[PDB]
Amino acid sequence: EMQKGGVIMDVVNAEQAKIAEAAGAVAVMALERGVARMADPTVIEEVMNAVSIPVMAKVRIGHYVEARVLEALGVDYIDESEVLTPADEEFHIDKRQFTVPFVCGCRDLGEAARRIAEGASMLRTKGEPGTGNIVEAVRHMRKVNAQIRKVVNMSEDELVAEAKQLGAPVEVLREIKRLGRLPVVNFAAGGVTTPADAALMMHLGADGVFVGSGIFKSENPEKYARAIVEATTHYEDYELIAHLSKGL
Amino acid sequence: MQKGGVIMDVVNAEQAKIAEAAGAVAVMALERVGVARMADPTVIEEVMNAVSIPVMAXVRIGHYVEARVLEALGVDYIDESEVLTPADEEFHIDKRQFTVPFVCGCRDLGEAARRIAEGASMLRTKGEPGTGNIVEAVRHMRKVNAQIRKVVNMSEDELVAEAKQLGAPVEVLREIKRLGRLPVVNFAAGGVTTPADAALMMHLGADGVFVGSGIFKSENPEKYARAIVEATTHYEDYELIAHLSKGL
Amino acid sequence: EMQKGGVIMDVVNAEQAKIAEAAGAVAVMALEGVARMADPTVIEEVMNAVSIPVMAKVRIGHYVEARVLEALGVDYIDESEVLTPADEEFHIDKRQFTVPFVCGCRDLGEAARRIAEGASMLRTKGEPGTGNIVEAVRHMRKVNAQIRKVVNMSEDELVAEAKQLGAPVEVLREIKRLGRLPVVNFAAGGVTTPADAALMMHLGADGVFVGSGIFKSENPEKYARAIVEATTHYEDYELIAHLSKG
Amino acid sequence: EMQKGGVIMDVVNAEQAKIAEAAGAVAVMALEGGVARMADPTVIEEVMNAVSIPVMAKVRIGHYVEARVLEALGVDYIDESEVLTPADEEFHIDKRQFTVPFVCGCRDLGEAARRIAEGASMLRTKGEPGTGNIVEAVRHMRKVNAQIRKVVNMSEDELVAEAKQLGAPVEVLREIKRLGRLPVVNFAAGGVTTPADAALMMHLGADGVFVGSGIFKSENPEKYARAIVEATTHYEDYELIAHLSKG
Amino acid sequence: MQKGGVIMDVVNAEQAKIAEAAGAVAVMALEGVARMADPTVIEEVMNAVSIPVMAKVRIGHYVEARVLEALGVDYIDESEVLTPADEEFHIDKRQFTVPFVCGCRDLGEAARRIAEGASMLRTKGEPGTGNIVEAVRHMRKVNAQIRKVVNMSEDELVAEAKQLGAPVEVLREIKRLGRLPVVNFAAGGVTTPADAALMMHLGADGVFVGSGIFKSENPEKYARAIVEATTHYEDYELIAHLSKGL
Numbered sequence A: 001e002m003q004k005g006g007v008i009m010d011v012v013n014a015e016q017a018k019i020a021e022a023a024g025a026v027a028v029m030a031l032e033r034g035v036a037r038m039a040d041p042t043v044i045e046e047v048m049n050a051v052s053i054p055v056m057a058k059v060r061i062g063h064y065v066e067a068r069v070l071e072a073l074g075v076d077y078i079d080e081s082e083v084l085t086p087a088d089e090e091f092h093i094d095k096r097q098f099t100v101p102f103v104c105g106c107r108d109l110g111e112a113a114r115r116i117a118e119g120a121s122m123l124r125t126k127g128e129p130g131t132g133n134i135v136e137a138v139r140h141m142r143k144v145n146a147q148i149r150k151v152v153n154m155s156e157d158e159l160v161a162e163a164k165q166l167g168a169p170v171e172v173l174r175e176i177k178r179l180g181r182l183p184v185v186n187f188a189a190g191g192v193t194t195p196a197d198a199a200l201m202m203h204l205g206a207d208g209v210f211v212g213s214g215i216f217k218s219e220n221p222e223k224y225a226r227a228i229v230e231a232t233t234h235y236e237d238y239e240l241i242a243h244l245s246k247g248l
Numbered sequence B: 001m002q003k004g005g006v007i008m009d010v011v012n013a014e015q016a017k018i019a020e021a022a023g024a025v026a027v028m029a030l031e032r033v034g035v036a037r038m039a040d041p042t043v044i045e046e047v048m049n050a051v052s053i054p055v056m057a058x059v060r061i062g063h064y065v066e067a068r069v070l071e072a073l074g075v076d077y078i079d080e081s082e083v084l085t086p087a088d089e090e091f092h093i094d095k096r097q098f099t100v101p102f103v104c105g106c107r108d109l110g111e112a113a114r115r116i117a118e119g120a121s122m123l124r125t126k127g128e129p130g131t132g133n134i135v136e137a138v139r140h141m142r143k144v145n146a147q148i149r150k151v152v153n154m155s156e157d158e159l160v161a162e163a164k165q166l167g168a169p170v171e172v173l174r175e176i177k178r179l180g181r182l183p184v185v186n187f188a189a190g191g192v193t194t195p196a197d198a199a200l201m202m203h204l205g206a207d208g209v210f211v212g213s214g215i216f217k218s219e220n221p222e223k224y225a226r227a228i229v230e231a232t233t234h235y236e237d238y239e240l241i242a243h244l245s246k247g248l
Numbered sequence C: 001e002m003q004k005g006g007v008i009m010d011v012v013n014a015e016q017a018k019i020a021e022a023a024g025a026v027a028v029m030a031l032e033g034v035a036r037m038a039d040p041t042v043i044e045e046v047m048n049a050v051s052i053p054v055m056a057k058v059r060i061g062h063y064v065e066a067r068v069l070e071a072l073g074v075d076y077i078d079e080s081e082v083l084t085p086a087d088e089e090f091h092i093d094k095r096q097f098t099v100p101f102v103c104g105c106r107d108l109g110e111a112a113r114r115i116a117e118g119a120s121m122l123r124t125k126g127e128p129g130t131g132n133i134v135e136a137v138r139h140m141r142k143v144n145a146q147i148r149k150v151v152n153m154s155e156d157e158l159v160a161e162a163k164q165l166g167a168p169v170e171v172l173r174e175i176k177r178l179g180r181l182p183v184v185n186f187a188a189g190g191v192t193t194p195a196d197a198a199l200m201m202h203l204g205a206d207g208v209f210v211g212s213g214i215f216k217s218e219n220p221e222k223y224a225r226a227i228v229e230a231t232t233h234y235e236d237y238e239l240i241a242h243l244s245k246g
Numbered sequence D: 001e002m003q004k005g006g007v008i009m010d011v012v013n014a015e016q017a018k019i020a021e022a023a024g025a026v027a028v029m030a031l032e033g034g035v036a037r038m039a040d041p042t043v044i045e046e047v048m049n050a051v052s053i054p055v056m057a058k059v060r061i062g063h064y065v066e067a068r069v070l071e072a073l074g075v076d077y078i079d080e081s082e083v084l085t086p087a088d089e090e091f092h093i094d095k096r097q098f099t100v101p102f103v104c105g106c107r108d109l110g111e112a113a114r115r116i117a118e119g120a121s122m123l124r125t126k127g128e129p130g131t132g133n134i135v136e137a138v139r140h141m142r143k144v145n146a147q148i149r150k151v152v153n154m155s156e157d158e159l160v161a162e163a164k165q166l167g168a169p170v171e172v173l174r175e176i177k178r179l180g181r182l183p184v185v186n187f188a189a190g191g192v193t194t195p196a197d198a199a200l201m202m203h204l205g206a207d208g209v210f211v212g213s214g215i216f217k218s219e220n221p222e223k224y225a226r227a228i229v230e231a232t233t234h235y236e237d238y239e240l241i242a243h244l245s246k247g
Numbered sequence E: 001m002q003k004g005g006v007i008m009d010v011v012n013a014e015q016a017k018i019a020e021a022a023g024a025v026a027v028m029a030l031e032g033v034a035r036m037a038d039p040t041v042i043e044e045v046m047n048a049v050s051i052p053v054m055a056k057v058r059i060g061h062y063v064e065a066r067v068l069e070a071l072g073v074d075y076i077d078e079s080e081v082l083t084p085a086d087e088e089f090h091i092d093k094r095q096f097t098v099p100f101v102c103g104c105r106d107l108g109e110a111a112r113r114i115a116e117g118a119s120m121l122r123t124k125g126e127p128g129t130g131n132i133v134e135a136v137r138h139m140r141k142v143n144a145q146i147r148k149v150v151n152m153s154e155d156e157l158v159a160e161a162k163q164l165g166a167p168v169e170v171l172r173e174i175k176r177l178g179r180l181p182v183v184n185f186a187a188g189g190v191t192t193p194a195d196a197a198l199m200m201h202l203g204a205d206g207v208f209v210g211s212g213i214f215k216s217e218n219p220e221k222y223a224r225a226i227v228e229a230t231t232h233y234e235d236y237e238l239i240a241h242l243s244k245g246l
């Protein structure tokens, strides 16, 4: 349901949210930005009222009540996020018990499958945040997709052992083999900075990309956001991507 | 399914009839106890023709074709057995593809759950074979059942992490929590020698016991087999068990 | 290429060779401390006894043993790890020969190196003489799992995959293109029962090698026959069950 | 690049590019801690319009799309460069899929052969960058060329094992043995600072040299660039090199 | 000795004559601790043939060597198969009239033996195994190291010498000649005609063969086959024919 090919953008207020929507973002991620927690509900409501596209926000890993709060606020997606300060080092939220869908992070297929078994409706394949360095996203998108291709083509009777080795639930691997891909959407995130970066993640088999606040620190945010959106959609149109790269 | 019962190893029709007469719920046809393989089909047919109770026979771990052969012979259960020389060190038979039910070995809940995910219809909790030493059976029945009790009572949102730690498929753990026990029958095996041994395994939560060829090396096999059968059925009748122990 | 589905049998003389041929073997392997190439006399005896292809073994790296067998008119040379290796580091440059070679392998890296040296056929095999099929199974599972990975992997990842496997990338590229090895790959190592032979086919072997154990049985021709039929009809479990009785 | 004996120069603008061309460079490399990426296309176009010699630019290792962008801009060579921040730690670009030729870095023959198997059209043998220390270039040119000489003269039947040990594709080694050298041009790079440095790399068997922005931080860039060009071309003319070193 | 030749171990005059008759280019006279042979046995062999006679001495045993020199032996073999007399220092062979053959396992050893005054080399691993791998490993190593030196940049030789433990002047000489400045024969497990021809294929100048020859049913035929195989080492039809008897 999350528009494959799409871009999700971090926004801290209504103004930024409108710009993101206008640029063609498929959704926005409402943020406030020591200990980093769920954002003030006021800020989230401000963003929810400002746009018609889906609004995400987010919670600390394992913070069941932060998630219930966001659910009660009417948020469209909850992001159980590793960039916030984890509330639980061992157990993620049991997302199956919620009405609102969750996006979760993953670095390999084992993690992806465990997040899915917990009830994740969407994945974000991501390494380290805030670096501006795409290598984080690339490493993990390459890993996850390589592991998927292996599972898709492997002998059926080898899956249980593969699941053991990956730390994955076998039924998720069986579903992956059946579909030829993950049963949920998987967006890239981590250092996606240029239009070429965004298109690269699509080339590597991402379903879409997350982009951070860097967009709004540029001289012309609406042009920059726009370039990312178009590059992500038209990820094989290298003449366009070249042209879009000139402004920055 | 066949709870409270005793399954006996037999090498011929004579032994098989004795086992049936003693009250065994099934027999396990063997050639002997170098490389140990599936038994000659002739020996298995001899045992099948000699009795009306279910007949089991052993295949090497991972030996898909040995299993198909036994299936074609009309065997009632296939035992994918660790006492035979493994054919595959990494991958067990995909038992879901078979008509005939399988029994598999396990030493802990992770193994049990993996065998179930491969399609096992019954479990045999067992350590080392041929020792006459019950400690093998006890160690593993205690481990499996302790791990089950933990899962049954644990917080629902901790299961995915528990599954990862055990190397188990989470859907099997979820099923275990739902039923309050394993979704298949779990018999003890390994060194069950005396009537007290058999009753002990039932005390520890086994659904039944396997016993080996030791029975037929005694002076009075039919009496000995009988004593095991009665002790396993009446596992809390200590006066009876005491009386049954006097002979041999 | 060899009749995929086939059985290749070890024979020490003309009598055994004829039995193997009669049982339906696709080829025979002529055989005779340090284990060397067999006396040419024994190989010629086997060559004259049958019309099916005749193979014979040389020590790993023993270029001249191979040239000798080539001169004798052998149909295939088996550069064999069960003989005492003559060279621990370098296999024969089989590209320089007219006669085709079969080589052993335990994983895809080895397979690809043997192919780059000019191997025309592979034998996926672990330890010999054990009667234990686990040797064959371990390596056939490994080689085929690695092939499936290569066939489906992203094209731009192959150079790195080759580095990691110790394989020549052009062989991996060829594998990806064909969806399989560019040569026939038979299982060997402890193939003892008809069920064993059929199992190897189930695991994706193109055929099987079987050793002298056949001729130590009470009825070699019946035994050889059972292996041949099981290998050909590897999914006919009723037949395999029947064949296992004797 | 095509012309062996040549010098390739880093330039950040049209002015520098013209100077490089005037000094006799065979090509220019257009350039713009923190993250180092492909340069703004505007800067690359500025350099392309300023000169008639080939223009190189760039991309991060593994950054397939940055490379496609430069291809679309009409760049003459793409440099998949280790001095930029790698985008992919494991997989380099599949350069066979491109129209424009690539130069890649290498530190030994195994790397060189892997880059060639990925479709590299040119090599840059280089250690650490930005030091002004020629030891980086020397170590690796000595290693690569020593390994080549070994392969060229070694017994044919030992190449498969040699390839395994190097981590090289055997067909590239076979090609090397057949030609008596690498099938692509191999330039030195890394700390080439003086005319003597440039001539040394040629003495050690380089096909040419890359030089960095240091040239344009000198008092007389055109004279300095010129001295490097002449020293690289006339690498055994020690009287000339001595004279060129005075300024 | 003469290139392409075979040197044979003999324990008496009878064996020595057979070796000479078979076409050996020289013979090696032989007789817990293994020492120089009784001079009587060596004289018996010297009187029995016209081809050169060698014998082997213990390593470092300067006086054993002087004794053999005084007996009129044609070559002294400072041999690792005898019990070493000196673990650290080989004989200073430059002080002798009679030429020495020495063993080596790699180019460093070869070059050190040459610097001590060796006139001939024997590239050899372990003795008495019947396993050619010993000879092959070391002939491949020595010749690979030579090819490297022959083609390497002149200014890199001093460092190469340091790394090999070799005298640089010997490496310089090797580079100049394109080969070792002395003859280098293979030894160690050379058993069949194919073995002998293989060593020549690998770049040996000749081969040593042990007493195994005289434990065969027909020593003169066997010795003969080795001689012809070593001389005609690329004539595979001949080598194949020569292998039949044995």
Ligand SMILES: O=C[C@H](O)[C@H](O)[C@H](O)COP(=O)(O)O
Residues within 6 Å of the ligand: A061, A082, A089, A090, A105, A106, A107, A111, A114
């Ligand atoms: O930075 C977020 C990481 O993925 C965490 O270490 C996460 O808690 C690990 O996932 P799992 O608990 O499934 O290993």
Ligand SMILES: C[As](C)(=O)[O-]
Residues within 6 Å of the ligand: A164, B089, B090, B091, B111, B114
């Ligand atoms: C450790 As297992 C092969 O029994 O799942």
Ligand SMILES: C[As](C)(=O)[O-]
Residues within 6 Å of the ligand: C088, C089, C110, C113
């Ligand atoms: C090429 As190999 C059998 O030495 O790994």
Ligand SMILES: C[As](C)(=O)[O-]
Residues within 6 Å of the ligand: C160, C163, D089, D090, D111, D114
């Ligand atoms: C294949 As590489 C030189 O990045 O190790």
Ligand SMILES: C[As](C)(=O)[O-]
Residues within 6 Å of the ligand: E087, E088, E089, E109, E112
């Ligand atoms: C055999 As030595 C003493 O030269 O190392």
